[PDB]
Amino acid sequence: AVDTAEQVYISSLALLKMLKHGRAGVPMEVMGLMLGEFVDDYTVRVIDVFAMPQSGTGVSVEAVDPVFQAKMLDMLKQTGRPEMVVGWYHSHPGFGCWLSGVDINTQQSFEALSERAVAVVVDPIQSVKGKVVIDAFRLINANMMVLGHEPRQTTSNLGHLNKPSIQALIHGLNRHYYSITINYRKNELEQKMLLNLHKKSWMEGLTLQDYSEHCKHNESVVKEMLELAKNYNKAVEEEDKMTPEQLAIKNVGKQDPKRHLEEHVDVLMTSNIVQCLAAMLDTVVFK
Amino acid sequence: CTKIINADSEDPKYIINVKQFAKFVVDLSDQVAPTDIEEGMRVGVDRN
Amino acid sequence: KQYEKSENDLKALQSVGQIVGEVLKQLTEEKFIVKATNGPRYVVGCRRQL
Amino acid sequence: SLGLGLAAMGTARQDVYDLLKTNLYQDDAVTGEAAGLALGLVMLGSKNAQAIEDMVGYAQETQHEKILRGLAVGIALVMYGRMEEADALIESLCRDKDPILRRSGMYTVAMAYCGSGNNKAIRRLLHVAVSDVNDDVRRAAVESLGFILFRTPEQCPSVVSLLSESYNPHVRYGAAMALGICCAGTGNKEAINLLEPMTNDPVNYVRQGALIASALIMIQQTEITCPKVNQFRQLYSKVINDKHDDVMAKFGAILAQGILDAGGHNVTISLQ
Amino acid sequence: TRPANHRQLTFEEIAKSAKITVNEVELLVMKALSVGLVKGSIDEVDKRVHMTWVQPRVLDLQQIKGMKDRLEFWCTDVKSMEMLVEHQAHDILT
Amino acid sequence: EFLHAQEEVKRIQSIPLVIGQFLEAVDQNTAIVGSTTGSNYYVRILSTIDRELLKPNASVALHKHSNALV
Amino acid sequence: AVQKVVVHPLVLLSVVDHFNRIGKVGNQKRVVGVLLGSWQKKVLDVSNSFAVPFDEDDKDDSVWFLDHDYLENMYGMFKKVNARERIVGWYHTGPKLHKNDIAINELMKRYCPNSVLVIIDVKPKDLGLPTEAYISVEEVHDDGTPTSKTFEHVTSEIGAEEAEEVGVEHLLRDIKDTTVGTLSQRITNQVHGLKGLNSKLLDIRSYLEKVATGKLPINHQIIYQLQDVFNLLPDVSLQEFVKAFYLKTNDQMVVVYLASLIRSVVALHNLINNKIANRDAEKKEG
Amino acid sequence: ENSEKIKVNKTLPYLVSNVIELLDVKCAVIKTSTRQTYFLPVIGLVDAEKLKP
Amino acid sequence: LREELQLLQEQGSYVGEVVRAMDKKKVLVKVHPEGKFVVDVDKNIDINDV
Ligand SMILES: [Zn+2]
């Protein structure tokens, strides 16, 4: 009985507790615990995340408070749901993700206690634009050290979700742990109530921004579009057989031919239509 | 390697400079004898 | 009175610092050019209502 | 159970059907692929009352997904060529928000509409091939093209001409297998013209399926029959003696050596 | 009494119903503007008094009945002419 | 998809950027820039900036991580 | 007097899960929990929450349990892991509030004096209402009414934060529509913007039907006196507002002769450039 | 228990520095031996009357 | 455009002056603000090109 290509399920609230606790203590490598359920042999799920108080030692086994462990679990049994811990996490701000020296020491304690106890490393400050730098890892033994680690077998969902990155494989990858696959438990009864409630405005759709700011904009764009038409005349009346595909590449200027064309005309079209349709509907509805 | 400014009683309380880096206040380790940590002495200092 | 000082210290445990700099010039309404006292230059913004 | 469902395939025998039910209700994670595939094979082309109903009733409350993927093909395989009688089931599985079950309906609309140029099928299957969000169900859309169009292999290069040129590799992957299963053993040279940039893709696994589909099309074809045989035998031999490709990249190559000389050049593949 | 249908009131209606003389309707309405229970204006070449009114008070259940009928005309104008826009622009809606 | 490509490009320039100086131009869209942190670099640049503003020198904005011209 | 509350989008979410925790045995149809918040200004902010074991019986409808002991120690733990956070109020669900809510609110005002409750709607998620916030005032009562508790209104909204909108955008990835799409998107903004115009109308339709009928007591203070202010200003006076419509001609003028001509002439270039490239590649094929 | 927590939170290194001035709106400016100037809203485990520039 | 966006999201290179080359695809480079370095070459560049 040995590993395969596993799968990690995370709940929607779990990821939100990761990025919020990472954004809170952005300099000093925050630490917390990960609470879920072992559903089968080789897929792990997590439903809940609660953090840890800050220890002066740092991210290690000494940052784990056993009296804050059991008494926090004492409350969650009688309210919500009791379940077994399945792992832990921390935050590593100075890089993306790889298990460091004091990372790997406290991992050995957890895999001695649990079956797997999957680590999770998240950089909070790298994730900016629309994506998150989250990845989960899991330590390997020394029994197959001259053999091929990660004993994976009959599947084809292993080549996805990441190739081993060179900022991560320069450290303990791949002869020390292995990387694991993470998708999201995307659910209904949460997805639309997050979407429609976060981005919404009722009366904005038929406002006017009315005319003194708008006729000035219609005044402006036509004036350079006149000179854009004069520059459009200049290339059309030119029309010389100087190998015109080579004549165009020696006359590149980030300019007229069709790019600096009707793009403005489309904006002039859409602005006045939405302005006039809002004007005509408002005369219709109100008295 | 570094240099030591001084020490305080009942504890390490060791004040150590680099003259290029900053000045730390650190602890002695287990492999030292606490007598031969005289002032102005070059000493091997951990990185972490 | 002693417990008051302890709870003030538990409150006093999140002063992650602030970086001291000086405004060089004003770029836009919410973009500025500042410089650290020993470091490089930056383009920054304000909080909300500064 | 895989051996029992394969040897008793299409029997509609009650006794093998009964112990496969109590195998299914063991609720083990790893035999769910084993129970679901064999339960369809003993009920192939049956359209039974209790077979569809118990399998579609069991496929929501379970906790694993190997249990779901075995029953995914199984409820696709319980109906076969009914050609109008699955339409309530086809509408039911795709409207659900389960991604495996939507994928399961795509294999069901493939097997109920085998070899027929159904306009309603090619409209609806291509419709979810555009607008759906999960990659796995989008593949089973563009993989099901050969199952409904293998009788007339001429339309298949025309319709997958731009399906091979999407932006995601998953649509391009099932596009490559669609060339492999629509045209069975023809010396087409038009599909082979399409597969040449398909085996020269940046992404590895769509090249893999291009190698397998190139192996499926040209078994038992000499160089005088079509001039692309020995071109690809040395291309298979190049990438299998190559070192710096993936195991994923070379799994299709060693498999292509097994396909191309299968049966000692005595048998072929022909759905027709 | 007339809820802004044609709220430009003529001077003789004030001078009769208040039974005040004609020359003192202007000093009467400048006082009501000075207090601030109305925010209208005064013409004198036509002597019609234009009205914009923001002061609220009680409205005695019978005037809810007339307010219901005006709200019901308000209903079918909004409802039906939205069905015109949706049925016209259905194919670019999505 | 062409609009989402426009969106993720046109929000690379709203970041608390660092300030450097343009030094040399190699070829099409790749240059040497020296930062105010020193330690002279070599990065690729965008596809938007008109190249008639970088003739010997320019006060320029730089990315944090990829350190590109912005 | 609180200006408005700000819904951090973790708290609601963390009400949905705990309604789903007890939902396998859920027949109480209500979940009371403690609303953690960050008091900033007259405007209020909400960052976190947790739950409490709660029972209630409709029989005698005053028999219920918050747990003070559970409320002391678990909030003490959230104080220890985060010194920024404190209590600001509580919440419950099951969109019809019940008669007990005077008792819960007047109890736990001894934790924060200007405490505030927020009703979420876990099952209703459809038209126009994310949440609602209530507040308590006790004046004499009015000019002439008997005194009571009288839950009042605080306006509400859904706020956000940097490094949690990243979790918003990356977890959804479903429809991903931008506001751009100015032909198709802005017309639909006018469509369902007007589909709420009759929705608020059908709500004000139903209210004065059941109070003109005369069931519920007429709120003489605000419920129509604010409507008495309202019902005078759809001014549609014609013969000068008729002369608004050469500016309509002016807004039309830019569309007609500029945008229809140039768009046609540019596509006419694509004809001759193709008809040349058609046959001059055809005559050189042989 | 609080004093035990402060005991384990005064570990391990102490980066020495220089206080340049003090303000109220309690506030202080710190220059380290890395020659970097910092500012605080909250001073810490000392008394402001016990300190000076 | 997507290929243009991915290649720009990548860490920049360092500039350093070559003093003179070692043997077997190794050179001797001080960058600017550091010590010298003996590094390895890529595929497309050669010793004779240095
Ligand atoms: Zn770590």
Residue B38 identity (one-letter amino acid):
E
Measure G9 CA to ligand 1 centroid, in angstroms: 28
Q: Measured between CB atoms, does F1 come within 8 Å of chain G?
A: no
To the nearest whole Å, the CA of A203 is away from the closest chain C CA by 25
How many helices (H) and strands (E) are present in chain G, helices listed first? Answer: 10, 9
Cα→Cα distances A155→A52, A158, A181, G223, Å: 38, 7, 13, 66
Contacts with C16 from chain A: Cβ below 8 Å: 25-28
Question: How far away, in angstroms, is A32 Cα from ligand 1 center?
Answer: 12
Close Cβ partners of H33 (under 8 Å, ≥ 6 residues apart): B22, B23, H15, H16, H17, H18
Rounded distance between C-alpha atoms, residue A128 and residue I9, angstroms: 13
Q: Do A188 and D97 touch (CB under 8 A)?
A: yes
The span from the CA of D198 to the CA of D232, in Å, is 13
* Residue carrying structure tokens 């006039």: A276
Element holding G47 (H helix, E strand): strand G44-51
Q: Say whether the peptide bond before residue D37 is cis (omega within 30 degrees of 0).
A: no
- The CA distance from D123 to D129, in Å, is 10
Chain E positions touching A285 (Cβ under 8 A) are 77-78, 81
Calpha distance E53→E39 (Å, rounded): 6
Select from A178, A177, A134 the least CA-distant residue to A5. Answer: A178
Strand partners, A50: A33
Q: CA of G79, closest CA in chain C: separation in Å?
A: 9
Measured distance CA(A197)–CA(A195) in Å, rounded:
6
Angstrom CA distances, G227 to E2, E33, G153, G186, stand at: 17, 22, 17, 30
Are G89 and G120 contacting, i.e. CB atoms less than 8 angstroms apart? no
Which chains are adjacent to chain E, needing at least 3 Cβ pairs under 8 Å? A, G
Q: Does the beta carbon of G282 lie under 8 angstroms from any beta carbon of chain A?
A: no
Question: Cβ separation of A276 and G252 shorter than 8 Å?
Answer: yes
d(CA D235, CA D215): 11
* Residues of C whose CB is below 8 A from A27: 16
Instruction: Look at residue G126 and give its three-state secondary structure.
Output: coil
Quickly tell me which residue has 């109920």 as its tokens: D112
Q: How far apart are CA D138 and CA D111, in angstroms?
A: 17
Q: Which of H2, H3, H5, H14 to mutate to test the interface with A (most CBs of A within 10 A)?
A: H5
Name every chain A residue with its beta carbon within 8 A of the beta carbon of C13: 54
Contact flag for D and C (3+ C-beta pairs < 8 Å): no
Q: CA G117 to CA G108: how far, in whole Å? A: 11
Torsion of CA H15, H16, H18, H19, to 10 degrees: 70
Maximum Cα–Cα distance across chain B: 30
Structure tokens at H4: 């035990």
Which among A187, A184, A3 has a CA at the least distance from the CA of A111?
A3
F12 shares contact with chain C (CB less than 8 Å): no
Question: With a CB-CB cutoff of 8 Å, which residues 84-113 of chain G face chain C?
Answer: 84
**Parallel, antiparallel, or unpaired for β G63-64 and G56-57?**
antiparallel
Is the CB of residue A28 less than 8 Å away from at least one CB of chain C? yes
Q: Is G95 near chain A, with CB under 8 Å?
A: no
Name every residue whose Cβ is closer than 8 Å to that of residue G21 and which is 6 or more positions away in sequence: A80, A81
A173 in Cβ contact with A179 (< 8 Å) = yes
Which chain A residues are Cβ-neighbours of H11 within 8 angstroms?
Answer: 56-57
Q: D110, D148 in Cβ contact below 8 A?
A: yes
Token duo for residue G61: 């409808």
Q: What is the DSSP string of A182-229?
A: EEE---TTTHHHHHHHHS--SGGGG----STTTHHHHHHHHHHHHHHH
C-alpha–C-alpha distance, residues D5 and D24, integer Å: 13
Contact A130 F8 (CB under 8 A): yes
* Distance set, CA D102 to CA A270, D27, D76 (Å): 39, 22, 11
The secondary structure of residue G110, as a DSSP letter, is: G
Q: Could you give the 3-state DSSP secondary structure of residue F67?
A: coil
The H or E element containing residue D5 is helix D2-7
Report the relative pairing of strands G116-120 and G86-92 from DSSP bridges. parallel
| B11 dihedral zone (left: phi>0; alpha: psi -120 to 50; beta) | beta
Quote the CA–CA distance of D128 and D141 in Å, as a whole number. Answer: 7
Distance from Cα H16 to the centre of ligand 1, integer Å: 27
Q: Do chains I and E touch (3 or more CB pairs under 8 A)?
A: no
Q: How far apart are CA A116 and CA A1, in angstroms?
A: 13
How far does the centroid of ligand 1 lie from the alpha carbon of residue B30, in Å? 26
- Kindly give, in sequence order, each residue whose CB lies less than 8 Å from that of residue G87, ignoring residues fewer than 6 positions away: G34, G35, G36, G37, G75, G111, G112, G115
- The interface residues of chain G toward chain A in range 156-185, judged by CB-CB distance below 8 A, are 158, 160-164, 166-172, 174-175, 182-183
The rounded distance, in Å, linking the Cα atoms of E14 and E19 is 8
Residues 194-253 of A with CB under 8 A from C: none
Q: At a CB cut-off of 8 Å and minimum separation 6, what does E77 contact? A: A284, A285
d(CA D29, CA I18): 62
List residues bridging with D180 in a β-sheet. none
Phi, psi dihedrals of residue A228, rounded to the nearest 5°: -65, -35
CA distance linking residue G13 with residue G30, whole number of Å? 16
CA torsion angle for D197, D203, D209, D215 (degrees, to 10)? Answer: 50
Nearest partner of A18 among A68, A72, A90, judged by Cα = A90
Spell out which residues of chain G touch residue E74, defining contact as CB-CB under 8 Å: 201
How far is the C-alpha of E26 from the C-alpha of D110, rounded, in Å?
87
Q: Separation of A99 CA from ligand 1 center, angstroms?
A: 5
Q: Distance between CA atoms of D227 and D237, rounded to whole angstroms? A: 17
Q: Helices in F1-70 by DSSP H: which ranges? A: 2-9
For F52, which residue in chain A has the nearest alpha carbon? A253
Burial of A242 (0-12, 13-18, 19+ CB in 10 A): exposed
Distance CA H37, CA D163 (A): 61
Residues in chain G closer than 8 A to E2 (CB atoms): none
Residue C34: partners with Cβ closer than 8 Å, 6 or more residues away: C21, C22, C23, C24, C41, C42, C44
Closest to C19 measured CA to CA, from C43, C2, C44, C36: C36
Between A and C, how many CB-CB pairs are < 8 A?
Answer: 5
Q: Look up residue A128 and give its amino acid.
A: V
Structure tokens at D90: 């086809």
Angle at which helices D204-217 and D191-198 cross, to 10°: 150
| Pairing label, strands H37-40, F30-35 | unpaired
A239 touches chain D (CB under 8 A): no
> What's the CA gap between G35 and G32, in Å, rounded?
10
Residue F55 DSSP class: S
Residues of F in contact with I15 (CB under 8 A): 32, 40-42
How is B8-25 classified by DSSP, letter by letter?
-TTS--EEEE-SSS--EE
| Gap from CA of A28 to ligand 1 centroid (Å) | 12
Distance CA D114, CA D182 (A): 11
**Nearest alpha carbon to residue A124 among A89, A170, A172, A168:** A89
Q: How far from C4 is each of C9, D37, G76, G87, H53, CA to CA, in Å? A: 9, 69, 16, 20, 27
Q: What do you get for the CA distance between the two ends of chain I, in Å?
A: 35
Q: Are strands A182-184 and A7-10 parallel, antiparallel or unpaired?
A: parallel
Closest C-alpha among D135, D9, D39 to residue A156: D135
Which residues are CB-neighbours of G82 under 8 A, at least 6 positions away?
A24, G48
A57: tokens are: 């030692």
CA A2 to chain centre: 31
Ligand 1 centroid – CA A179 distance (Å): 15
Q: How many angstroms separate the CA atoms of A110 and G13, rounded?
A: 30
Q: Do D204 and A159 touch (CB under 8 A)?
A: yes
CB D108 within 8 A of CB D73: no
Is C40 in contact with F18 (CB distance < 8 Å)? yes
For chain G, the structural domain boundaries read 2-182, 223-282
| Distance from the first to the final alpha carbon of chain G | 87
C-alpha–C-alpha distance, residues H42 and H48, integer Å: 11
